[PDB]
């Protein structure tokens, strides 16, 4: 009447549930920080519909796509024409995009700079999301594995 079969099935169901919860929790933390940095880097000012336009898609890796759009919007609002944002606005926006470099000099031509920094932002989210993903997956699995073997010991008593 050996309980090995039930514990194998309890732990297998344990692993698959814990991987799932850890994925959902993982690449949902990872969008939380992408949405946090886009607001921090003033990109929100370049395109006002960006926090939702990226979140409503799931998959935070997809912000890479908005590169050409930011480049366009950056030149249109902080161009040589005189621009539509404040000069101090544009000073920081250029700094954050890594395009004009805090001490005054030129960093990168804007075509390299925008794709670079949000490739940096996705790589910085992947480590955090994989971190949350394996904490949550282990936390959930050992929690539901112990309750299930506790109930499987409780069941063989009767």
């Amino acid at each position: 009447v050996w309980k090995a079969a039930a514990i194998k099935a309890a732990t297998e169901y344990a692993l698959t549930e814990g991987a799932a919860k850890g994925l959902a929790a993982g690449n949902a933390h990872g969008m939380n920080i992408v949405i946090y940095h886009l607001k921090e880097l003033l990109i929100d000012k370049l395109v006002p519909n960006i926090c939702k336009t990226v979140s409503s898609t799931g998959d935070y890796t997809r912000v890479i796509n908005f590169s050409k759009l930011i480049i366009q919007k950056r030149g249109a609002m902080c161009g040589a024409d005189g621009g539509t944002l404040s000069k101090d606005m544009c000073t920081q926006i250029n700094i954050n995009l890594g395009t004009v470099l805090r001490n005054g000099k030129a960093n990168l031509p804007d075509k390299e700079a925008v794709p670079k920094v949000l490739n940096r932002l996705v790589s910085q989210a992947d480590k955090a999301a994989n971190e949350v993903a394996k904490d949550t997956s282990q936390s959930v699995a050992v929690k539901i594995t112990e309750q299930q073997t506790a109930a499987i010991n409780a069941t063989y008593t009767s």
């Binding site: 040589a80 024409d81 606005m89 000073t91 030129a106 031509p109 804007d110 075509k111």
Partner: protein, 99 residues
């Protein structure tokens, strides 16, 4: 290492209000991106649309359609040829006549 750019204006440096203007950066060949700067920390335009004017120099152009009063003053320019940028060209002053 890299030569200094040059900035000129077409038709010229004195433009009636409402007219148009085109700034013309020039540097060597093989240039990736030209950048026109008005207040270099904040306001600038960037273009990879570079055309070759001679065997040893290329150039790019930036155009303002309706010239405003706030368009007058400094402009200068600089180009990127990986891995480094150039130094910054001499200034150009755009003046804007009301009539």
């Amino acid at each position: 290492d890299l030569p200094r750019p040059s900035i000129s204006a077409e038709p010229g440096t004195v433009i009636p209000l409402g007219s148009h203007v085109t700034f013309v950066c020039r540097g060597p060949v093989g240039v990736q991106t030209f950048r026109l700067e008005r207040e270099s920390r904040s306001l600038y335009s960037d273009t990879e649309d570079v055309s070759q004017t001679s065997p040893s120099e290329s150039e790019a152009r930036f155009r303002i359609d309706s010239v405003s009063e706030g368009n007058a003053g400094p402009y200068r320019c600089i180009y990127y040829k990986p891995p480094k940028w150039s130094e910054q060209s001499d200034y150009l002053e755009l003046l804007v006549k009301e009539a």
